[PDB]
Amino acid sequence: SWEDQEIVQGIVEPAGTAVEYGDHTNIPLTSWNANFERRTIVRGELGMMVGTLE
Amino acid sequence: SWEDQEIVQGIVEPAGTAVEYGDHTNIPLTSWNANFERRTIVRGELGMMVGTLE
């Protein structure tokens, strides 16, 4: 909206590898991570000055 | 009951001796006394564990 500062996009990375099965073995677990991506808004300006004789 | 600690058994000893009957003779009387014996309770515990593959 020309006054906002940043635009943000989310990314999620899952995680987890299988393990061989065992009745009394430890249960492996899956998980995930999340990062956010910011792009800054740049405002440029340009002007003019005009005179009567010009 | 399973959630008990002791079991009590009572023994009653009675007493009394008969006499010859008379209309105006004083009446003999019987009586009793009681004793108790207590035995503690022991709980045994045993279990099993079964896996899906097993």
Side-chain angles (χ1 to χ4, degrees):
Chain A
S1 54
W2 185 85
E3 61 244 8
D4 291 12
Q5 179 63 11
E6 275 188 340
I7 295 141
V8 179
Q9 171 57 278
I11 182 168
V12 60
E13 307 131 23
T17 55
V19 184
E20 271 166 305
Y21 175 81
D23 275 325
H24 298 153
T25 55
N26 307 323
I27 288 150
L29 303 175
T30 62
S31 176
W32 50 269
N33 187 69
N35 287 22
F36 303 91
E37 307 315 19
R38 323 144 279 283
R39 304 274 172 275
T40 316
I41 289 162
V42 178
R43 300 164 221 78
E45 57 150 335
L46 200 35
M48 53 137 60
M49 166 166 27
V50 200
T52 44
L53 187 59
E54 178 196 328
Chain B
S1 185
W2 177 80
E3 54 262 83
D4 275 12
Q5 187 78 100
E6 277 182 12
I7 278 204
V8 188
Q9 173 71 86
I11 184 183
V12 165
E13 154 159 22
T17 45
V19 310
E20 261 155 344
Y21 169 75
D23 292 326
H24 300 142
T25 67
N26 47 24
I27 303 173
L29 307 172
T30 68
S31 73
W32 57 267
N33 95 316
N35 282 22
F36 311 104
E37 184 76 295
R38 60 207 304 197
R39 298 277 153 97
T40 70
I41 292 172
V42 176
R43 275 166 301 276
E45 167 180 54
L46 197 38
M48 76 152 141
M49 161 144 90
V50 194
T52 42
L53 202 78
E54 176 221 313

